[PDB]
DNA sequence: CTCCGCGCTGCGA
DNA sequence: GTCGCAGCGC
């Protein structure tokens, strides 16, 4: 290809800037390499392509008159949008590039963004995580020999951003620039064909921008809170070990399923219930007989909490010197089958719910272990959690129009406490969090295709009894099953399911021969038709909330922006985490009211349904100590 | 072979 | 290493 080193002659550089200021669409690729003496990232330059196999390299490390500050001035001049300039930038791994640009160059991009990976996921949510090699092979094969010059393109990291390759930063960035530009033109052609370009440019890419702002913010984390909770949990763990070995007369292994099987079903004559299964469903039923199953469940819960939540967060914590805080910086991921947004490194979505452990000799003492309490706002701030009240159920009500579901939605009573009251034959006010959560699983499973076998095994009852429960549900809420049958019919005639925004989940297995294959495909259809719609509504809410918060301004978009500027008082909302039906923000005090009215008004007014979207706003000094807000 | 769904992560074979 | 299993979250 033609790599044009624009920063080599002054006339060449000025003509390059002249041409660049005319373009309405161009690709961008950062050129990161190693710090000579160790190994760390260093932005050596950048690459721009606006057509053909020509990549313009903007060196940032040889006309001496082009001082680096002049180059940065022209860079910010070309990268910042103005009034109705309608520029569309194309970058691979848009969030990482935005973060690295803002943090290593002080450049806040303001143009419209187009990511090829997001387009690939939109065309097929079940597709593998797109790599530059995969995109080039599937959409721009004739230029694949370019990537044949190396093997780094086989990774999800940007080729130009991958400093590990023996190739130079310039060559990698140039190749990525041209390839991403042309492959994005092809992907845009396909998206326009399938009427999904709108959802790509108005919902998904702005959501990626909000995700980048979140990742720049990071969630605050208190280490002393984690220390205290971990000490209590380890004390209770040792107590559980000693008490269980006393109750068993010998030392078993809580991980060894055969050890506990021998202890329960043989040494203690506990009734099996094919048999000799030490699963959670069987131990929950056996808890009502001997204390040891409950102790094993508590041991497993505490061990999971302290090995898969405590230590990862304690290792992933970083100091934010400008804020005087210790924040956790997770990574976003939207490449999911149903459009939901998950997190990684660490998954602060999987933080355990609030549970209690009783310690003491005479009946113990209650000690609440809320791991979500170690997440706190900045000094003088407030965590603000806005939750969609029964989002998927309202979506199913708008779809199926089963008047019983609409009625029980209008009544305003916990349908899971209702299930548990019909289940255990108790009062709904007596249903605790554990039993209500079991009932929530029962509810959503039965709605999405739970079998009588698993329903009975979880309910602690027989198969033919859970069958009666399923038939009762189907007789009561009839429009739901009518719409489920219509959905399998539509996905069988069409071969795919379509969410509310028009996204497509391609499920060919709905016409498979194996009954399990067909059943799983039908269940995936009936699930995704609602789950992806919920994710889409959450995304629309998020992007409108961010736009509204940016309207009032007098506020830094992300934290990263404000610490980059400092190198000022905090005053505004800050995206920190997104539960799949609930948004979390970190609002400064003076705005905890205003921002709240922004989150509730947008979330309610994110999409028009036959059932109004109910939102519940809570404010607190931590994600664990949240109390309802007025708004 | 085998019957709610989406997701992550540590440990073990 | 790679993946499966089982723990948890929505
Ligand atoms: C009069 N009650 C109480 C609860 N409930 C209900 C409501 C919904 C919803 F979401 F549409 F409102 C769903 C379910 C089901 F079946 F999906 F779990 C519901 O439970 C059922 O109907 N049964 C038959 C049921 C009850 C307890 C179980 F252990 C299993 C099944 C009612 O209608
Ligand atoms: N298919 C399925 N979906 C689930 C399951 N648990 C949660 N979800 C989905 C559907 C509801 C949504 C929100 O989860 P919550 O646990 O926050 O549930 P909720 O019923 O919306 O509200 P609440 O906060 O009152 O418990 O996530 C589950 O076991 N199966
Ligand atoms: Mg909820």
Residue numbers in the entry: 1825 to 1860, 1894 to 1917, 1930, 1935 to 2145, 2171, 2175 to 2260, 2303 to 2510, 2527 to 2590
Task: Reproduce text from the manuscript describing this model.
The DNA damage response (DDR) protein DNA Polymerase θ (Polθ) is synthetic lethal with homologous recombination (HR) factors and is therefore a promising drug target in BRCA1/2 mutant cancers. Polθ is a unique DNA polymerase (Pol) and DNA helicase fusion protein that promotes multiple DNA repair mechanisms. The majority of Polθ’s DNA repair activities require it’s carboxy-terminal A-family DNA polymerase domain (Polθ-pol). For example, the DNA synthesis activity of Polθ is essential for its functions in MMEJ (TMEJ, Alt-EJ), translesion synthesis, and ssDNA gap repair.
A previously optimized highly soluble Polθ-pol construct (PolθΔL) was used for X-ray crystallography in which five short disordered loops were replaced with serine-glycine linkers. We conducted co-crystallization experiments using PolθΔL, along with RTX-152, DNA/DNA primer-template with a 5’ 10 nt ssDNA overhang, and incoming 2’,3’-dideoxyguanosine triphosphate (ddGTP). The structure of the resulting complex was determined to a resolution of 3.24 Å. The co-crystal structure of PolθΔL complexed with DNA/DNA, ddGTP, and RTx-152 shows the enzyme in the closed conformation with the inhibitor residing in an allosteric binding pocket located in the fingers domain of the polymerase. Within the binding pocket, RTx-152 forms hydrophobic contacts with many of the surrounding residues and a hydrogen bond with Y2420. Upon RTx-152 binding, Y2412 shifts its position to form pi stacking with the inhibitor, which in turn engages residues W2366 and M2402 to facilitate hydrophobic packing within the binding site. The pull of the N alpha helix towards the inhibitor brings E2365 closer to R2419, allowing for the formation of a salt bridge with a distance of 3.6 Å between the two residues. The salt bridge forms over the inhibitor and blocks its exit from the binding pocket. Intriguingly, the binding of RTx-152 to the closed conformation of PolθΔL appears to lock the enzyme into this state on the DNA/DNA, which likely prevents or slows the transition back to the open conformation which is required for subsequent nucleotide binding and addition cycles. This is due to the fact that the inhibitor occupies the same space as the N and O alpha helices during the open to closed conformation shift.
